[PDB]
Design a protein around this motif. Structure first.
Motif, PDB file in Angstrom:
ATOM      1  N   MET A   1       0.873  -1.220   0.000  1.00  0.00           N
ATOM      2  CA  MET A   1       0.000   0.000   0.000  1.00  0.00           C
ATOM      3  C   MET A   1       0.893   1.249   0.000  1.00  0.00           C
ATOM      4  SD  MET A   1      -3.309   1.128   0.033  1.00  0.00           S
ATOM      5  CE  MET A   1      -2.591   1.835  -1.452  1.00  0.00           C
ATOM      6  N   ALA A   2       0.708   2.094  -1.024  1.00  0.00           N
ATOM      7  CA  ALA A   2       1.262   3.450  -1.097  1.00  0.00           C
ATOM      8  C   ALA A   2       0.963   4.198   0.208  1.00  0.00           C
ATOM      9  CB  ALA A   2       0.692   4.171  -2.295  1.00  0.00           C
ATOM     10  N   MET A   3      -0.276   4.066   0.701  1.00  0.00           N
ATOM     11  CA  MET A   3      -0.746   4.811   1.884  1.00  0.00           C
ATOM     12  C   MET A   3       0.165   4.526   3.082  1.00  0.00           C
ATOM     13  SD  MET A   3      -2.373   7.122   3.140  1.00  0.00           S
ATOM     14  CE  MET A   3      -3.887   7.766   2.436  1.00  0.00           C
ATOM     15  N   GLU A   4       0.471   3.254   3.296  1.00  0.00           N
ATOM     16  CA  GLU A   4       1.349   2.902   4.381  1.00  0.00           C
ATOM     17  C   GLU A   4       2.711   3.590   4.197  1.00  0.00           C
ATOM     18  OE1 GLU A   4       1.564  -1.173   5.449  1.00  0.00           O
ATOM     19  OE2 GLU A   4       3.339  -0.852   6.695  1.00  0.00           O
ATOM     20  N   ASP A   5       3.243   3.551   2.973  1.00  0.00           N
ATOM     21  CA  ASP A   5       4.520   4.166   2.636  1.00  0.00           C
ATOM     22  C   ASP A   5       4.450   5.685   2.824  1.00  0.00           C
ATOM     23  OD1 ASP A   5       5.312   1.623   1.917  1.00  0.00           O
ATOM     24  OD2 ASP A   5       5.404   2.036  -0.236  1.00  0.00           O
ATOM     25  N   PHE A   6       3.342   6.295   2.381  1.00  0.00           N
ATOM     26  CA  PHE A   6       3.168   7.754   2.471  1.00  0.00           C
ATOM     27  C   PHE A   6       3.320   8.196   3.927  1.00  0.00           C
ATOM     28  CE2 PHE A   6       0.188  11.052   3.798  1.00  0.00           C
ATOM     29  CZ  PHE A   6       0.845  12.145   3.288  1.00  0.00           C
ATOM     30  N   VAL A   7       2.651   7.465   4.819  1.00  0.00           N
ATOM     31  CA  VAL A   7       2.631   7.732   6.243  1.00  0.00           C
ATOM     32  C   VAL A   7       4.057   7.665   6.812  1.00  0.00           C
ATOM     33  CG1 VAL A   7       1.804   6.871   8.466  1.00  0.00           C
ATOM     34  CG2 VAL A   7       0.267   6.862   6.509  1.00  0.00           C
ATOM     35  N   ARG A   8       4.790   6.612   6.449  1.00  0.00           N
ATOM     36  CA  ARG A   8       6.123   6.410   6.992  1.00  0.00           C
ATOM     37  C   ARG A   8       7.066   7.492   6.468  1.00  0.00           C
ATOM     38  NH1 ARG A   8       5.331   1.792  10.074  1.00  0.00           N
ATOM     39  NH2 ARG A   8       3.669   0.706   8.923  1.00  0.00           N
ATOM     40  N   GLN A   9       6.738   8.098   5.334  1.00  0.00           N
ATOM     41  CA  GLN A   9       7.653   8.992   4.679  1.00  0.00           C
ATOM     42  C   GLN A   9       7.256  10.452   4.889  1.00  0.00           C
ATOM     43  OE1 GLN A   9       7.541   7.005   0.817  1.00  0.00           O
ATOM     44  NE2 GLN A   9       8.274   5.217   1.945  1.00  0.00           N
ATOM     45  N   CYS A  10       6.068  10.744   5.436  1.00  0.00           N
ATOM     46  CA  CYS A  10       5.647  12.161   5.577  1.00  0.00           C
ATOM     47  C   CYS A  10       5.413  12.557   7.047  1.00  0.00           C
ATOM     48  CB  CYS A  10       4.418  12.457   4.726  1.00  0.00           C
ATOM     49  SG  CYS A  10       4.610  13.912   3.661  1.00  0.00           S
ATOM     50  N   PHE A  11       5.520  11.613   7.985  1.00  0.00           N
ATOM     51  CA  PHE A  11       5.411  11.920   9.397  1.00  0.00           C
ATOM     52  C   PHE A  11       6.682  11.453  10.114  1.00  0.00           C
ATOM     53  CE2 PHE A  11       1.022  11.611   7.953  1.00  0.00           C
ATOM     54  CZ  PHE A  11       0.498  12.773   8.455  1.00  0.00           C
ATOM     55  N   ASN A  12       7.079  12.154  11.181  1.00  0.00           N
ATOM     56  CA  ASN A  12       8.297  11.804  11.882  1.00  0.00           C
ATOM     57  C   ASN A  12       8.056  10.519  12.674  1.00  0.00           C
ATOM     58  OD1 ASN A  12       8.352  12.089  14.894  1.00  0.00           O
ATOM     59  ND2 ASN A  12       7.702  14.187  14.421  1.00  0.00           N
ATOM     60  N   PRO A  13       9.108   9.686  12.828  1.00  0.00           N
ATOM     61  CA  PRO A  13       8.971   8.370  13.449  1.00  0.00           C
ATOM     62  C   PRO A  13       8.304   8.284  14.828  1.00  0.00           C
ATOM     63  CG  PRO A  13      11.076   8.550  12.346  1.00  0.00           C
ATOM     64  CD  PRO A  13      10.469   9.934  12.316  1.00  0.00           C
ATOM     65  N   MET A  14       8.419   9.301  15.687  1.00  0.00           N
ATOM     66  CA  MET A  14       7.696   9.237  16.962  1.00  0.00           C
ATOM     67  C   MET A  14       6.185   9.220  16.674  1.00  0.00           C
ATOM     68  SD  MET A  14       7.486  11.624  20.368  1.00  0.00           S
ATOM     69  CE  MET A  14       7.284  10.879  21.992  1.00  0.00           C
ATOM     70  N   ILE A  15       5.738  10.022  15.702  1.00  0.00           N
ATOM     71  CA  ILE A  15       4.290  10.130  15.419  1.00  0.00           C
ATOM     72  C   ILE A  15       3.795   8.778  14.890  1.00  0.00           C
ATOM     73  CG2 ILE A  15       2.538  11.210  13.971  1.00  0.00           C
ATOM     74  CD1 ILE A  15       4.162  13.882  14.375  1.00  0.00           C
ATOM     75  N   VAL A  16       4.480   8.265  13.874  1.00  0.00           N
ATOM     76  CA  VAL A  16       4.166   6.961  13.309  1.00  0.00           C
ATOM     77  C   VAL A  16       4.086   5.898  14.424  1.00  0.00           C
ATOM     78  CG1 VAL A  16       4.866   5.181  11.655  1.00  0.00           C
ATOM     79  CG2 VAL A  16       5.328   7.581  11.130  1.00  0.00           C
ATOM     80  N   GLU A  17       5.117   5.840  15.273  1.00  0.00           N
ATOM     81  CA  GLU A  17       5.197   4.838  16.336  1.00  0.00           C
ATOM     82  C   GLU A  17       3.976   4.915  17.244  1.00  0.00           C
ATOM     83  OE1 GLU A  17       9.646   3.684  17.884  1.00  0.00           O
ATOM     84  OE2 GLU A  17       7.800   3.506  19.068  1.00  0.00           O
ATOM     85  N   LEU A  18       3.699   6.136  17.699  1.00  0.00           N
ATOM     86  CA  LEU A  18       2.564   6.417  18.550  1.00  0.00           C
ATOM     87  C   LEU A  18       1.257   5.988  17.861  1.00  0.00           C
ATOM     88  CD1 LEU A  18       3.890   9.731  20.130  1.00  0.00           C
ATOM     89  CD2 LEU A  18       3.232   7.676  21.354  1.00  0.00           C
ATOM     90  N   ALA A  19       1.084   6.358  16.581  1.00  0.00           N
ATOM     91  CA  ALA A  19      -0.118   5.962  15.830  1.00  0.00           C
ATOM     92  C   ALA A  19      -0.219   4.431  15.758  1.00  0.00           C
ATOM     93  CB  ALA A  19      -0.118   6.588  14.457  1.00  0.00           C
ATOM     94  N   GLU A  20       0.858   3.784  15.308  1.00  0.00           N
ATOM     95  CA  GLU A  20       0.899   2.319  15.204  1.00  0.00           C
ATOM     96  C   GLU A  20       0.545   1.683  16.548  1.00  0.00           C
ATOM     97  OE1 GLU A  20       4.669   1.622  13.143  1.00  0.00           O
ATOM     98  OE2 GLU A  20       3.613   0.330  11.703  1.00  0.00           O
ATOM     99  N   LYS A  21       1.187   2.150  17.621  1.00  0.00           N
ATOM    100  CA  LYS A  21       1.009   1.562  18.935  1.00  0.00           C
ATOM    101  C   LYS A  21      -0.489   1.553  19.244  1.00  0.00           C
ATOM    102  CE  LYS A  21       3.209   1.503  23.178  1.00  0.00           C
ATOM    103  NZ  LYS A  21       2.311   0.734  24.072  1.00  0.00           N
ATOM    104  N   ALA A  22      -1.099   2.744  19.216  1.00  0.00           N
ATOM    105  CA  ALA A  22      -2.513   2.936  19.514  1.00  0.00           C
ATOM    106  C   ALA A  22      -3.361   1.953  18.687  1.00  0.00           C
ATOM    107  CB  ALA A  22      -2.899   4.376  19.248  1.00  0.00           C
ATOM    108  N   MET A  23      -3.104   1.880  17.381  1.00  0.00           N
ATOM    109  CA  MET A  23      -3.890   1.006  16.518  1.00  0.00           C
ATOM    110  C   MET A  23      -3.760  -0.450  16.983  1.00  0.00           C
ATOM    111  SD  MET A  23      -3.512   2.484  12.701  1.00  0.00           S
ATOM    112  CE  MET A  23      -5.001   1.745  12.026  1.00  0.00           C
ATOM    113  N   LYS A  24      -2.522  -0.904  17.204  1.00  0.00           N
ATOM    114  CA  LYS A  24      -2.248  -2.322  17.470  1.00  0.00           C
ATOM    115  C   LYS A  24      -2.751  -2.744  18.864  1.00  0.00           C
ATOM    116  CE  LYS A  24       2.147  -2.075  15.969  1.00  0.00           C
ATOM    117  NZ  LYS A  24       3.476  -2.726  15.867  1.00  0.00           N
ATOM    118  N   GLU A  25      -2.835  -1.824  19.830  1.00  0.00           N
ATOM    119  CA  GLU A  25      -3.435  -2.128  21.147  1.00  0.00           C
ATOM    120  C   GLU A  25      -4.943  -2.389  21.033  1.00  0.00           C
ATOM    121  OE1 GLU A  25      -1.562  -0.226  25.003  1.00  0.00           O
ATOM    122  OE2 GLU A  25      -2.006   1.290  23.483  1.00  0.00           O
ATOM    123  N   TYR A  26      -5.610  -1.707  20.107  1.00  0.00           N
ATOM    124  CA  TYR A  26      -7.040  -1.901  19.932  1.00  0.00           C
ATOM    125  C   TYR A  26      -7.296  -2.762  18.682  1.00  0.00           C
ATOM    126  CZ  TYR A  26      -6.415   1.623  23.504  1.00  0.00           C
ATOM    127  OH  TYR A  26      -6.000   2.299  24.616  1.00  0.00           O
TER     128      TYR A  26
END
Ligand SMILES: Cc1cc(=O)c(O)c(C(=O)O)[nH]1
Ligand SMILES: [Mn+2]
Ligand SMILES: [Mn+2]
Length: 179
Positions: free
Chosen positions: A1-26
């Motif tokens: 998915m381009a979308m997944e790549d877009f996210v990793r490439q347009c947001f800083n890694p702390m933001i991505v990590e925080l977003a991923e964490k939240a998603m994967k806990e729920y």
């Protein structure tokens, strides 16, 4: 998915990590709910940008629930401010009110209503941003100076146009996942 790549490439890694964490806990997969992921990151970044533009602001969004509630309870004890039922996004020590931040692909008045109705009976200040450079805020009190507001709007518009470069914006706008 381009979308997944877009996210990793347009947001800083702390933001991505925080977003991923939240998603994967729920139990949410960012590789599947890619619009949700983009929205979570987007909204996180706005929250961070908003606090940066002032120790005017306490950041509540982006912490685990224990820490968020610890911060809220602490602010309440020391200010007198009533406790919200929902975790807001920031606290403003200058205006002495919590702030809920909305970021929407729909019309700002529409999302504003949704929010005001979700947390009706709270005295939480509401500030909505779109990807078109519109905002709406409780009592048209926009809290920030024009420069700070303008910086948020440019970042939002830029996300939108990046998505559009990559043919992702149509999916994203017709989704409401993350709002
Ligand atoms: C869906 C949604 C939108 C927000 O703007 C927000 O702050 C939250 C939050 O969980 O704190 N959730
Ligand atoms: Mn929040
Ligand atoms: Mn919010």
């Amino acid at each position: 998915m381009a979308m997944e790549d877009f996210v990793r490439q347009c947001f800083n890694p702390m933001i991505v990590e925080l977003a991923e964490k939240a998603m994967k806990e729920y139990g949410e997969d960012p590789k599947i709910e890619t619009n949700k992921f983009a929205a979570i990151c987007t909204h996180l970044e706005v929250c961070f940008m908003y606090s940066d533009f002032g120790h005017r602001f306490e950041i509540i969004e982006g912490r685990d629930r224990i820490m968020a509630w610890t911060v809220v309870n602490s602010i309440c004890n020391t200010t007198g401010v009533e406790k919200p039922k929902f975790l807001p996004d920031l606290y403003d020590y200058k205006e002495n009110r919590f702030i809920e931040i909305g970021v929407t692909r729909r019309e700002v008045h529409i999302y504003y209503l949704e929010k005001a109705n979700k947390i009706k009976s709270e005295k939480t200040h509401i500030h909505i941003f779109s990807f078109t450079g519109e905002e709406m805020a409780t009592k048209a009190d926009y809290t920030l100076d024009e420069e700070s507001r303008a910086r948020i709007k440019t970042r939002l518009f830029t996300i939108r146009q990046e998505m559009a470069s990559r043919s992702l914006w149509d999916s994203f706008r017709q989704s409401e996942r993350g709002e």
